[PDB]
User: Fold this.
Amino acid sequence: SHYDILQAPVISEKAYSAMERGVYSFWVSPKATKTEIKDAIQQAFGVRVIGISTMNVPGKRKRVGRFIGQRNDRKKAIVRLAEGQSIEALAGQ
Amino acid sequence: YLTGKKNLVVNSVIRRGKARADGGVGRKTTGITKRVQRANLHKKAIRENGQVKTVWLSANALRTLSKGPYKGIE
Amino acid sequence: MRNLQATDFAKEIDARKKELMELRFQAAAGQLAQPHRVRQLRREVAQLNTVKAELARKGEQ
Amino acid sequence: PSAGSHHNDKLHFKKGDTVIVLSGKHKGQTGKVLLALPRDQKVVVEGVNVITKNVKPSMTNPQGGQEQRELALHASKVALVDPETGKATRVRKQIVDGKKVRVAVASGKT
RNA sequence: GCUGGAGAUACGCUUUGACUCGGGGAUGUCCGAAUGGGGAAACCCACCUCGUAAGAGGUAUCCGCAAGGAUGGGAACUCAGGGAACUGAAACAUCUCAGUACCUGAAGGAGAAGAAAGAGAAUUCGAUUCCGUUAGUAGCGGCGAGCGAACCCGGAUCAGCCCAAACCGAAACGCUUGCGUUUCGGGGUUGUAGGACCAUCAAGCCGAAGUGGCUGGAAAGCUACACCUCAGAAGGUGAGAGUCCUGUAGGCGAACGAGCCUGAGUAGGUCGUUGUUCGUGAAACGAUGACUGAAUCCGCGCGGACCACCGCGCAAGGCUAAAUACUCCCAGUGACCGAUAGCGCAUAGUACCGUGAGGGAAAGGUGAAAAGAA
RNA sequence: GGACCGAACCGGUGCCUGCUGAAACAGUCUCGGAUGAGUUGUGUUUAGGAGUGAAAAGCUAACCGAACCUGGAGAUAGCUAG
RNA sequence: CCGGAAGGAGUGGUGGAGCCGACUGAAGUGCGGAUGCCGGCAUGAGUAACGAUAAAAGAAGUGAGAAUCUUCUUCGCCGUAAGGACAAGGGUUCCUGGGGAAGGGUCGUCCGCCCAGGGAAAGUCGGGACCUAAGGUGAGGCCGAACGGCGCAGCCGAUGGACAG
RNA sequence: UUGGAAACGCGACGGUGCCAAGAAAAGCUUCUAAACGUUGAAACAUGAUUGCCCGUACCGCAAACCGACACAGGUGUCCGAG
Ligand SMILES: CC[C@H]1OC(=O)/C=C/[C@H](C)[C@@H](O[C@@H]2O[C@H](C)C[C@H](N(C)C)[C@H]2O)[C@@H](C)C[C@@H](C)C(=O)/C=C/[C@H]2O[C@@H]2[C@]1(O)CO[C@@H]1O[C@H](C)[C@@H](O)[C@@H](OC)[C@H]1OC
Ligand SMILES: [Mg+2]
Ligand SMILES: [Mg+2]
Ligand SMILES: [Mg+2]
Ligand SMILES: [Mg+2]
Ligand SMILES: [Mg+2]
Ligand SMILES: [Mg+2]
Ligand SMILES: [Mg+2]
Ligand SMILES: [Mg+2]
Ligand SMILES: [Mg+2]
Ligand SMILES: [Mg+2]
Ligand SMILES: [Mg+2]
Ligand SMILES: [Mg+2]
Ligand SMILES: [Mg+2]
Ligand SMILES: [Mg+2]
Ligand SMILES: [Mg+2]
Ligand SMILES: [Mg+2]
Ligand SMILES: [Mg+2]
Ligand SMILES: [Mg+2]
Ligand SMILES: [Mg+2]
Ligand SMILES: [Mg+2]
Ligand SMILES: [Mg+2]
Ligand SMILES: [Mg+2]
Ligand SMILES: [Mg+2]
Ligand SMILES: [Mg+2]
Ligand SMILES: [Mg+2]
Ligand SMILES: [Mg+2]
Ligand SMILES: [Mg+2]
Ligand SMILES: [Mg+2]
Ligand SMILES: [Mg+2]
Ligand SMILES: [Mg+2]
Ligand SMILES: [Mg+2]
Ligand SMILES: [Mg+2]
Ligand SMILES: [Mg+2]
Ligand SMILES: [Mg+2]
Ligand SMILES: [Mg+2]
Ligand SMILES: [Mg+2]
Ligand SMILES: [Mg+2]
Ligand SMILES: [Mg+2]
Ligand SMILES: [Mg+2]
Ligand SMILES: [Mg+2]
Ligand SMILES: [Mg+2]
Ligand SMILES: [Mg+2]
Ligand SMILES: [Mg+2]
Ligand SMILES: [Mg+2]
Ligand SMILES: [Mg+2]
Ligand SMILES: [Mg+2]
Ligand SMILES: [Mg+2]
Ligand SMILES: [Mg+2]
Ligand SMILES: [Mg+2]
Ligand SMILES: [Mg+2]
Ligand SMILES: [Mg+2]
Ligand SMILES: [Mg+2]
Ligand SMILES: [Mg+2]
Ligand SMILES: [Mg+2]
Ligand SMILES: [Mg+2]
Ligand SMILES: [Mg+2]
Ligand SMILES: [Mg+2]
Ligand SMILES: [Mg+2]
Ligand SMILES: [Mg+2]
Ligand SMILES: [Mg+2]
Ligand SMILES: [Mg+2]
Ligand SMILES: [Mg+2]
Ligand SMILES: [Mg+2]
Ligand SMILES: [Mg+2]
Ligand SMILES: [Mg+2]
Ligand SMILES: [Mg+2]
Ligand SMILES: [Mg+2]
Ligand SMILES: [Mg+2]
Ligand SMILES: [Mg+2]
Ligand SMILES: [Mg+2]
Ligand SMILES: [Mg+2]
Ligand SMILES: [Mg+2]
Ligand SMILES: [Mg+2]
Assistant:
């Protein structure tokens, strides 16, 4: 179903101050074809999306002492919707 | 694999080369120069049983198959 | 909870999924003030799928 | 790592019950069981006390203080009482709460 | 009470019985025999059906009509095909190491073998296996180094059962006419010849008995009196506790969960070889790779060239518990270890070294209680 | 044009320097080839008594008259140490 | 101090929980050596070195602390490079804000080091859903004590072909 | 702006000479078999919706890769002004 594929919104000076341009930006399940994350965000927020772009992003740290580290990976999407389509209060941030 | 049809893996056996060549005939005896391993095999015909077939056969198979079909046949 | 129709199984599953993703958004904001609500929704989804499985094996044999 | 309590992880008393220390300092002292910890075998009681100077973390307290707080013991406070002293105790019978057994020593219940 | 190690704050759950324990179900991404197709393991690409899509299911080869079965894995053990050298012989060819090491195949909780064409010299025994013993005997041997049985006898364990065949009823395809190759019931299964055809254990609960004084930081120690004992095994607790805690001495215990025929390309033989104490030795016998090739109850195999007599067996079809082996795993125990010891590891096949196969560490200790020093 | 001079590039001539190095093969200077039997990238194939080799017993992952790893294996040691 | 020796006891100091003596029994039982083994610490010695002979100077700033960090102005060095863009390979080393034990051949307020947070966007660039080379693999098929070796079509395989900013 | 210089790039699949004689397959353009179609085809035009998976940071002649090193070594291509 839609809801669990979309993962958790980005939080940064960038993607937030890009929220003002009308772009929205958030993490998703790395196995996730573009069209799927598009339809998911569409039918989760009731907006029609005319642009998506997607990137796979991999972290890695190490807790003190022997423990090697290796934080888990992910994928991020950025979307642009039709001029009025800007998403509601969950975009309110 | 050389396995024959109701036939033979083809066995090994060391080959002994003896020298003195005078054992029971009145002589000192018979020394031995060396042993070494060997093997063999055999022939390859073709006959069938169900619908069609072509298989390896030994001379024993050609002999037995003239006496009667057994299971496979010419 | 079993009394519902499986169309209501789908509806009351999807509502928990939506609330779970909303709790996740909040927590990524950092303002996740009621952590137990997450696990409550997860176990509720678990019980829902399990009860529909029990109506699977039951009846049809 | 040494392993935990060997008392089959079985406490011999509830958090409700009154109890008396029978060893060390505080022997003879009595109180309610404010915290039972079976798997670690540890017993909170209003008997033992200790002045814990929590290190100042300014966590509402820039400069730190010294709290007075009770520091837990284990299976050395003796179980429940009744003839005013600790006692061995035995499983009993059914009551109006007939799904329950109670306790007694050479006497009644707890 | 719980909220995994974790020693962490916050959110909470739980007499409607949580948590933990014993038992079942259900969910179980992707890779891996991997098996829709490909592939640089965990990834990239499809097709068929159901579905409103979301989602679900199918798509490898090999035996089978079909049910159904097989691919892979497994410490050591088992069987099998293949099969070393160092080394000893004070050199080295035979010989030995040794059918050891290793590779490969097949399988199970074991496997192997097994129901006399035997062992053997009493006209004795009576499947197989394993232990003792015979016995370093009898033997084998450049008769050197060295290798080495079996019978009798004592024990562990102990069962033997089914087929093909003569002869009946076909039925199909076989032919000059009441028959003959593979099938299906009956029938029939052997040597002191028979058969034909004809007169308890898993979760767990119950469980006896000590108080005063003394040294102490603290008592289990000392002391004074006292109790239990089918229970004095053991751990724990401020130092050593039968009677403070946890306790198989004893007792109980589950939803529901484990336990005329008798075998032919056969026996036999010649050539090349080999097992057995068996090194070609007077070399039987088994086993075969090439070529050959019989008899059947006054019948056939064997008794260590061979012959006669005397004596023991019935091959050329199958199945078969238990006594046997091993220790990945579990419990108990120890004139075993106790931090350079003991497994490599008080845990890590980690760090580190190597392209790789592969190799591969050291490392423990506050205190009784964190009261962990405001 | 297996011609000439000569950068890149490939190479390694003589001297020095380095010799617990800057480097387990190098540096400065000098020197050979430099359209050819040339130089080089990616993919790939051949190996242990085996491969390769315009041939030194060279090379085959920094010491090859027979590589490495594990194993037989505590080989054997008329020898030296203790 | 004692016994003939190996050795044994007294006393005092430490230490903080197990242990002498006697008799018998069993040993992984007695160390200076092995270019022995593991570990620790010495000598050489405050010695050699601090890794290209492309130099550096002053002012100002920050800081507990500056020859070494920042800023300014000069100076010197490369410039078919000692500039720039890629593939391979590496794996967050990038940017911001902090830090300063250890790495940095000295220092260190700095760093490719430590901590946390962010950054990476493709119908059209490269690859894939396209193609084939060497090579690999391969139903059927040809061999082979086992394991296995070959082999047509086919399939895989860019280093090349095709393809819209 | 005027004047000049100039590629190994572009026009190109130009020219000429040489011998050692210089991949394949798909996309692509033509032809038909078969099939559907010959009322509703090809193709053109205009509007619309549609655009998947992976790689993009940074080092990259070097302190970020191979050299146990913040090592005087090694590392394929491209640009490299006056
Ligand atoms: C000086 C250069 C090298 O030495 C020699 O050639 C020779 C040194 C001695 C004189 C000689 O002794 C003599 O033997 C004789 C048989 C007998 C005589 N007696 C009478 C005393 C005795 O005097 C030898 C065998 C002694 C022995 C210890 C030894 O084997 C030393 C080996 C290597 O360290 C040395 C080097 O210094 C390393 O230099 C290398 O050179 C390469 C080119 C570099 O690439 C680099 O390699 C990376 C570098 O480092 C390795
Ligand atoms: Mg876009
Ligand atoms: Mg030999
Ligand atoms: Mg805890
Ligand atoms: Mg697959
Ligand atoms: Mg399948
Ligand atoms: Mg496959
Ligand atoms: Mg053999
Ligand atoms: Mg010898
Ligand atoms: Mg094996
Ligand atoms: Mg197997
Ligand atoms: Mg017997
Ligand atoms: Mg007492
Ligand atoms: Mg024979
Ligand atoms: Mg013979
Ligand atoms: Mg001989
Ligand atoms: Mg005979
Ligand atoms: Mg014979
Ligand atoms: Mg005889
Ligand atoms: Mg017979
Ligand atoms: Mg000991
Ligand atoms: Mg150890
Ligand atoms: Mg140590
Ligand atoms: Mg390495
Ligand atoms: Mg490695
Ligand atoms: Mg402790
Ligand atoms: Mg020339
Ligand atoms: Mg050369
Ligand atoms: Mg050079
Ligand atoms: Mg010259
Ligand atoms: Mg010349
Ligand atoms: Mg040779
Ligand atoms: Mg070499
Ligand atoms: Mg190396
Ligand atoms: Mg050698
Ligand atoms: Mg040795
Ligand atoms: Mg040996
Ligand atoms: Mg020798
Ligand atoms: Mg002394
Ligand atoms: Mg103590
Ligand atoms: Mg010793
Ligand atoms: Mg010494
Ligand atoms: Mg000595
Ligand atoms: Mg040392
Ligand atoms: Mg120097
Ligand atoms: Mg100042
Ligand atoms: Mg300055
Ligand atoms: Mg300087
Ligand atoms: Mg600087
Ligand atoms: Mg200024
Ligand atoms: Mg550059
Ligand atoms: Mg890369
Ligand atoms: Mg930086
Ligand atoms: Mg510092
Ligand atoms: Mg620090
Ligand atoms: Mg420093
Ligand atoms: Mg310093
Ligand atoms: Mg920084
Ligand atoms: Mg992308
Ligand atoms: Mg292809
Ligand atoms: Mg091809
Ligand atoms: Mg092949
Ligand atoms: Mg081919
Ligand atoms: Mg390419
Ligand atoms: Mg293009
Ligand atoms: Mg492309
Ligand atoms: Mg665009
Ligand atoms: Mg093709
Ligand atoms: Mg970039
Ligand atoms: Mg990257
Ligand atoms: Mg360098
Ligand atoms: Mg170069
Ligand atoms: Mg130029
Ligand atoms: Mg110039």
User: Anything to note?
Assistant: The beta strands of chain B are 15-18, 32-36. Residues 12 and 61 of chain B are 20 Å apart (CA to CA). The helical segments of chain B are 59-67. Chains B and A do not touch (no CB pair under 8 Å).
